[PDB]
Write an enzyme that holds these catalytic residues in place. Structure first.
Site, PDB file in Angstrom:
ATOM      1  N   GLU A  35      54.478  42.426  27.083  1.00 57.47           N
ATOM      2  CA  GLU A  35      53.253  42.690  27.855  1.00 57.47           C
ATOM      3  C   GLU A  35      52.133  43.150  26.916  1.00 57.47           C
ATOM      4  O   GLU A  35      51.008  42.654  27.066  1.00 57.47           O
ATOM      5  CB  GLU A  35      53.526  43.746  28.929  1.00 57.47           C
ATOM      6  CG  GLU A  35      54.388  43.257  30.078  1.00 57.47           C
ATOM      7  CD  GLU A  35      53.772  42.195  30.963  1.00 57.47           C
ATOM      8  OE1 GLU A  35      52.652  41.794  30.705  1.00 57.47           O
ATOM      9  OE2 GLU A  35      54.457  41.737  31.900  1.00 57.47           O
ATOM     10  N   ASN A  46      42.619  38.724  34.367  1.00 58.01           N
ATOM     11  CA  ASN A  46      43.288  37.676  35.165  1.00 58.01           C
ATOM     12  C   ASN A  46      42.220  36.722  35.714  1.00 58.01           C
ATOM     13  O   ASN A  46      41.044  37.142  35.888  1.00 58.01           O
ATOM     14  CB  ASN A  46      44.114  38.359  36.249  1.00 58.01           C
ATOM     15  CG  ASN A  46      45.179  39.267  35.664  1.00 58.01           C
ATOM     16  OD1 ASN A  46      45.392  40.388  36.138  1.00 58.01           O
ATOM     17  ND2 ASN A  46      45.856  38.776  34.652  1.00 58.01           N
ATOM     18  N   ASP A  48      41.800  35.832  38.673  1.00 57.67           N
ATOM     19  CA  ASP A  48      41.356  36.313  40.011  1.00 57.67           C
ATOM     20  C   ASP A  48      40.299  37.417  39.837  1.00 57.67           C
ATOM     21  O   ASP A  48      39.769  37.856  40.870  1.00 57.67           O
ATOM     22  CB  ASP A  48      42.515  36.753  40.918  1.00 57.67           C
ATOM     23  CG  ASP A  48      43.222  38.036  40.523  1.00 57.67           C
ATOM     24  OD1 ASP A  48      42.906  38.583  39.456  1.00 57.67           O
ATOM     25  OD2 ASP A  48      44.041  38.520  41.309  1.00 57.67           O
ATOM     26  N   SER A  50      41.005  40.460  38.569  1.00 56.39           N
ATOM     27  CA  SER A  50      41.776  41.708  38.355  1.00 56.39           C
ATOM     28  C   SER A  50      42.025  41.813  36.841  1.00 56.39           C
ATOM     29  O   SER A  50      41.799  40.812  36.080  1.00 56.39           O
ATOM     30  CB  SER A  50      43.053  41.726  39.159  1.00 56.39           C
ATOM     31  OG  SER A  50      43.968  40.794  38.607  1.00 56.39           O
ATOM     32  N   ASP A  52      44.805  43.664  33.874  1.00 56.65           N
ATOM     33  CA  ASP A  52      46.079  44.336  33.526  1.00 56.65           C
ATOM     34  C   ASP A  52      45.795  45.342  32.410  1.00 56.65           C
ATOM     35  O   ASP A  52      45.083  44.988  31.405  1.00 56.65           O
ATOM     36  CB  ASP A  52      47.134  43.372  33.002  1.00 56.65           C
ATOM     37  CG  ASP A  52      47.465  42.244  33.963  1.00 56.65           C
ATOM     38  OD1 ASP A  52      47.292  42.389  35.181  1.00 56.65           O
ATOM     39  OD2 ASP A  52      47.839  41.185  33.453  1.00 56.65           O
ATOM     40  N   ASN A  59      48.436  45.949  36.961  1.00 56.21           N
ATOM     41  CA  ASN A  59      47.258  45.187  37.435  1.00 56.21           C
ATOM     42  C   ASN A  59      46.449  45.998  38.447  1.00 56.21           C
ATOM     43  O   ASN A  59      47.016  46.731  39.269  1.00 56.21           O
ATOM     44  CB  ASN A  59      47.642  43.819  37.952  1.00 56.21           C
ATOM     45  CG  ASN A  59      48.246  43.871  39.316  1.00 56.21           C
ATOM     46  OD1 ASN A  59      47.540  44.101  40.304  1.00 56.21           O
ATOM     47  ND2 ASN A  59      49.543  43.632  39.362  1.00 56.21           N
TER      48      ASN A  59
END
Ligand code: NA
EC number: 3.2.1.17
Length: 129
Positions: A35, A46, A48, A50, A52, A59
């Protein structure tokens, strides 16, 4: 902060992540490796909109507030910035809520694709724990 492998395994163990919801410590270290490469300051935007955040790339869609993710929740009751701290307490406490949500560590797509079913104990091999 960029943790060492065994340094992060020790921090996660002390915060009670070792065998949390049945996931051995090497699962958590493996997820953090892919990650964030063990970097608390890791961020990823992301598609969308959003974001992380942190060692476990938590997220903003569900788990933290960053003020720029329309329609999102803050289920861990934290600013997403807390997930970038050199102190992993916020990341660990929020990871516990995530992994309790029904799909276990499948919530982390990198854990499912790169850790799940592998010899995850190799991630804590040689660590003094
Ligand atoms: Na949010």
């Amino acid at each position: 902060k960029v943790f060492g492998r065994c340094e992060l395994a020790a921090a996660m163990k002390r915060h009670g992540l070792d065998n949390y919801r049945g996931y051995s410590l090497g699962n958590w270290v493996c997820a953090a490796k892919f990650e964030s490469n063990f970097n608390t300051q890791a961020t990823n935007r992301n598609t969308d909109g959003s974001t992380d955040y942190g060692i476990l790339q938590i997220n903003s869609r569900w788990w933290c507030n960053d003020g720029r993710t329309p329609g999102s929740r803050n289920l861990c009751n934290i600013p997403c910035s807390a997930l970038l701290s050199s102190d992993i307490t916020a990341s660990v406490n929020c990871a516990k809520k995530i992994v309790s949500d029904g799909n276990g560590m499948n919530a982390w797509v990198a854990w499912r694709n790169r850790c799940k079913g592998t010899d995850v104990q190799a991630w804590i091999r040689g660590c003094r724990l």
